[PDB]
Design a protein around this ligand. Structure first.
Ligand SMILES: Nc1ncnc2c1ncn2[C@@H]1O[C@H](COP(=O)(O)OP(=O)(O)O)[C@@H](O)[C@H]1O
Ligand SMILES: Nc1ncnc2c1ncn2[C@@H]1O[C@H](COP(=O)(O)OP(=O)(O)O)[C@@H](O)[C@H]1O
Ligand SMILES: OC[C@H]1O[C@@H](O)[C@H](O)[C@@H](O)[C@H]1O
Ligand SMILES: OC[C@H]1O[C@@H](O)[C@H](O)[C@@H](O)[C@H]1O
Lengths: 384, 383
């Protein structure tokens, strides 16, 4: 996978060809994979993501124009890959429009809490596959936010940055996500997974640094997204039915006692959340002591839960997981992200990765892409 | 009440570097000081600590040299004279040695133990808003700033923890101060708006949010060793009880071994076992926002540090008592090694102005105040 220096150079060449000068500021923000703890973040639960070596790099310079001039080199983006617009004012504010990819940067600008924000020129380069479930969106948003910090440093907390980037995805991209993706992109540490408590936003670094251990990401290359807001609504319905603020304050037994207060579908939805939250806490402890096969088994429980109770999996994802579990050296595997496509995360012995890639691909009714990634750092400034 | 900003420090550091070396510095770096909310003298006992990084800071600017020489200048007034120094890099033949001035030992030690090569010569000026000798770990601030600087000359491979241990080894061998890992760890690991619960046995770390406009952290500098003796006693008591460190001992088991240790040694161990338990309790109190409970654990810590560990002094005890009389104050205690230094006070934000007035008026000396938030750890500054 491409490294920051190679990407930074690509962004510099493109900025030169496009604007005639060298960029003055450089910034990067990684993608992410969730090892376990799915569909718990908007339930104030626990998550265990790690930052990927896949990355977004932004280079640029301030302008006197009050204008924003943007260029992205990613081919999978909505055309046109270039866009320019004036800075928002108290009079007129930015508006979500076309091209779609620029809405992510527009939103971060609109909700940035510091002033005065100058105009700027910038080019975007990325090794994060757009729409593949590794949070290219969050990578883009956090990169933009980190870039704006160079033009106009902010005062508030890191959590505010995550919430600023999340607000943008809500209002300008129309996707009501949780804080997880933005948070891991901001808070990742290389050679570590990040156990995130989405109620208190307290953070715990769980070491992930074993040359014998590999994390295999498999993209199903499918994306069937309209049920995510439906699941979010169901969980809230069950929390009200039980007189609770969120499903995090609910454990299985209390859910069992109140079975008749919620719908049958609602009960299965809540059962995943309550069970995933505990599975996540168990996986963090298992990972601290190096119990990889225990962690792998918790990964498979998560997948079963996501497949049957939460119903956000799909045949492609299910087929990928089973093939992965047939390969020797695999500790566990499951879908990651929202579901209905996207990627599969697999914990396995590093030596088994080549064979795992061959076996998974051969038993998959479709084209599969693979990324072998280590735990990486979060957003950072790059000195040019 | 006083606190310089990063840009002001960076600008001050370049002016000094320009006046001294004739060119603009090429590299810039920063590393914060620290205040320990609770968990004192437990770190080298494999215990728990709850520090936060301060807005008080060391900024280092410099550039590589072709000389193979190191040229240093610090503008800190409390620094050992002379504040200018030049010396050659360590070689396979001759290695650096702790000499004079004392302050140069901190950078020399980090240089000697830096794990990467080849290290070029460099010029650098140090500026700092951390009071030297005030208990906010200016030493660790200087070391971590240095380490981050050398990473610019020659990036390292290892982990952040490895960087902390290099800076800790430097303080041991070149400063003659057998400290624990806490100060180096927080200077590298701090995150703004967060305290760091550090398990000094396993090095597990938790970022605990500290971001409440209703809550203020008041640091009081009294403006005023025995440390290696305390570390020795703890080791003396741990072997006597057949344990690797005081962390594996609970209060009741220590009472059984009363005849196995000296009277002083028993009191030392009683503090550690109780401080470790208080630190874990204070972190839990913080998660639920129970500031009153957190303040009480802070005051118990001071009592323990004053009576059993005896690392406080009359000035600190006077500052702590005055602070506890102020309404809105949750608790107060000494921080750092002791025998002087600063006092940390958790209080209602609205009470800060009165607390500073009350403490100052009832203190037999001139006191300095810092109203600080949890700050970020070491970072590179792009010039
Ligand atoms: N580097 C980039 N350049 C331009 N647009 C981007 C970039 N990264 C993401 N986007 C926009 O965000 C989208 C990613 O949306 P999403 O479905 O959340 O995928 P992911 O799971 O990768 O975040 C793409 O449709 C794209 O338009
Ligand atoms: N920025 C600086 N410039 C010069 N000397 C410094 C600087 N920071 C620390 N020192 C030196 O480091 C020492 C700090 O020692 P220490 O007793 O640990 O105090 P603290 O509690 O502030 O770390 C001082 O004795 C002083 O010589
Ligand atoms: O575990 C499901 C996750 O799905 C992601 O796509 C979403 O952005 C996150 O907020 C989280 O809900
Ligand atoms: O709480 C006592 C502390 O004292 C400091 O001076 C020391 O550097 C730290 O490592 C820690 O032991």
């Amino acid at each position: 996978q491409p490294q920051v220096a190679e990407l930074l150079a690509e962004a510099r060449r493109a900025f030169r060809e496009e604007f005639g000068a060298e960029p003055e500021l450089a910034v990067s923000a990684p993608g992410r994979v969730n090892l376990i703890g799915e569909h718990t973040d908007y339930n104030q639960g626990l998550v265990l993501p790690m930052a990927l070596e896949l990355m977004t790099v932004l280079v640029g310079s301030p302008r006197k124009d009050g204008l924003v001039s943007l260029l992205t080199t990613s081919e999978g983006a909505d055309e046109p890959q270039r866009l320019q617009f004036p800075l928002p004012t108290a009079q007129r504010s930015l508006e979500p429009g076309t091209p779609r990819w620029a809405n992510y940067v527009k939103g971060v600008i609109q909700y940035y809490p510091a002033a005065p924000l100058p105009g700027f020129s910038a080019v975007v380069v990325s090794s994060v596959p757009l729409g593949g479930g590794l949070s290219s969106s969050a990578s883009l948003e956090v990169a933009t936010y980190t870039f704006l910090q160079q033009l106009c440093p902010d005062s508030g907390t890191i959590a505010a940055r995550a919430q600023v980037c999340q607000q943008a995805e809500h209002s300008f991209a129309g996707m009501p996500c949780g804080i997880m993706d933005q948070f891991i992109s901001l808070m990742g540490q290389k050679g570590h997974a990040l156990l995130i408590d989405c109620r208190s936003l307290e953070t715990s670094l769980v070491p992930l640094s074993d040359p014998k251990l590999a994390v295999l990401i498999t993209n199903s290359n499918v994306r069937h997204s309209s049920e995510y807001p439906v699941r979010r609504r169901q969980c809230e319905e069950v929390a009200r039915a039980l007189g609770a603020a969120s499903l995090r304050e609910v454990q299985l037994e209390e859910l069992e006692a109140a079975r008749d207060l919620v719908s049958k579908e609602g009960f299965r939805r809540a059962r995943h959340v309550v069970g995933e939250i505990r599975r996540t806490a168990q996986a963090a402890a298992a990972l601290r002591r190096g119990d990889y096969r225990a962690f792998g088994r918790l990964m498979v429980e998560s997948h079963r839960s996501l497949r049957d109770d939460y119903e956000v999996s799909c045949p492609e994802l299910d087929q990928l997981v089973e093939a992965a579990l047939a390969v020797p050296g695999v500790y566990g595997s499951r879908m990651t992200g929202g579901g209905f496509g996207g990627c599969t995360v697999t914990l396995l012995e590093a030596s088994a990765a080549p064979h795992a890639m061959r076996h998974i691909q051969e038993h998959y009714g479709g084209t599969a892409t693979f990324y072998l990634s280590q735990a990486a750092d979060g957003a950072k400034v790059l000195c040019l």
